[PDB]
Amino acid sequence: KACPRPAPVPKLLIKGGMEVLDLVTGPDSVTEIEAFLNPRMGQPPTPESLTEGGQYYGWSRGINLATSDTEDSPGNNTLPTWSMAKLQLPMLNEDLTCDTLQMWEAVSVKTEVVGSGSLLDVHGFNKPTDTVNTKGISTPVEGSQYHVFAVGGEPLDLQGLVTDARTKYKEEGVVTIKTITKKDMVNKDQVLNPISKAKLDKDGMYPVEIWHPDPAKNENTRYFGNYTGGTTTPPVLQFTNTLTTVLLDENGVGPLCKGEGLYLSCVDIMGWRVTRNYDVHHWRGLPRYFKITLRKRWVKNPYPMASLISSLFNNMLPQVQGQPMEGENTQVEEVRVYDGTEPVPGDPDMTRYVDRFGKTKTVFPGN
Amino acid sequence: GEGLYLSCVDIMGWRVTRNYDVHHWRGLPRYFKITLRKRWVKNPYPMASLISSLF
Amino acid sequence: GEGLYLSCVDIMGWRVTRNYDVHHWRGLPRYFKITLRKRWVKNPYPMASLISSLF
Ligand SMILES: CC(=O)N[C@@H]1[C@@H](O[C@@H]2O[C@H](CO)[C@H](O)[C@H](O[C@]3(C(=O)O)C[C@H](O)[C@@H](NC(C)=O)[C@H]([C@H](O)[C@H](O)CO)O3)[C@H]2O)[C@H](O)[C@@H](CO[C@]2(C(=O)O)C[C@H](O)[C@@H](NC(C)=O)[C@H]([C@H](O)[C@H](O)CO)O2)O[C@H]1O
């Protein structure tokens, strides 16, 4: 009966995988999606065998240097590429009545990179600590590191700037500024080419070396990360299931998945591993976790029904082709409009316009 | 859609050649008389799914 | 004088030529999202002719 009533915690409906989503939620109903992206830089999954792909999985293959100032061709596995994905969500409701709809609104996200522990394997064949007698530790992951990520209701808008516009990237299997823009790179790309901007339309494809989170004047993604240059530089990481972050925006908005898709995107270099063999300096990354908490938010519909309805219904008419009644040579020399009834003017050939707001007895022709 | 789907089969069996044993077999046709009405349902849709289509 | 004045510098350090020790240092660019409003003030011209000119 009155056995003291426990604390009120929010009630979980059901859990499991994406399908759980399928179930009608209601409206305040929240969803937590834990997922993760594997780090994709260089050696791709596919050669599952540790012989053929020598399981350099999640590893820059080797480091394809360059001929000299003139020729820089980097291998396609000497190229850590932005890792990402998109979550497909249910569709929520309408009210064409109030021309308003609800959308999947991301709010906070816990995230974490895992495997920092792995960087403690110090046997194996890496350059030994003491080269001399060939002793020590098989020298750990060291070097530059980079970690960035984002979350959004549409893919990530990026900008590329490269070190050398002359780099011989392949036209094949990677998206380069060229790949996006036909015309080879110029010095501008090399610094801030307002042209050289793409989208995250692909994956494990645009390499980080090129593409960057472009602060479009506009954005529905929240991103961040950082660079930590250097050659010896030690790796550092953060283990914690304690912290949540706010994908929330300044008006208390956070992203909203237009296209019921949630978009994760990130990158995680810990630095290079180095073969005892030679200075085959290939770099490593770790996978990242994500815990997105999104709600249902009501939003004023952007574009007016009618328009769409009828924008559609008109694009169905047969196509016509025929003489120009618009363009630069409209065969229309004229158009007036009236609604009112002023009494007879004076000058009949008077003109009349309304502009930016106001309607005027056009200037007596003779300015 | 506004579709009425009829579907069937009617194997009677083997017709066998006064020859060897080419059992090539016969079927017959079928007739249908569907009696149907007009019923109100709740629309299973979100019209602005086209707005979603747009996005 | 209706001018927004942006200014900055972003030296990242040097790139050293596989050669001799030439060191050319690299820079990077900078985004800016200036948030600005309109504010009210007092007319300064009322400080008359010789009363504030070469004063
Ligand atoms: C698989 C292989 O070894 N291919 C040769 C290339 O050498 C390898 O290049 C890879 C990048 O493409 C890696 O950097 C390799 O490094 C590792 C590796 O992971 O594979 C690093 C490992 O530490 C090491 N493992 C061990 C235990 O030592 C491995 C190991 O050697 C192998 O896994 C096998 O055991 O090596 C690195 O060795 C070599 O770079 C390529 C050149 O490729 C291209 C290019 O520049 O992209 C391909 C072009 O198509 C070609 N041009 C034409 C017209 O074909 C050019 C051209 O030949 C070149 O510019 C002139 O030399 O080369 O060749 C492979 O033979």
From Swiss-Prot, chain A:
InterPro entries: Capsid_VP1_Polyomavir (IPR000662), dsDNA_vir_gr_I_capsid (IPR011222), Polyomavir_VP1_sf (IPR036931)
GO cellular component: host cell nucleus; T=7 icosahedral viral capsid
Transmembrane segments: none
Region of interest called C-terminal arm, as start-end residue ranges on this chain: 305-367
Phosphothreonine PTM positions: T341
One Pfam family here: Polyoma_coat
Keyword Disulfide bond: yes
Protein name: Capsid protein VP1
Organism expressing this protein natively: Murine polyomavirus (strain P16 small-plaque)
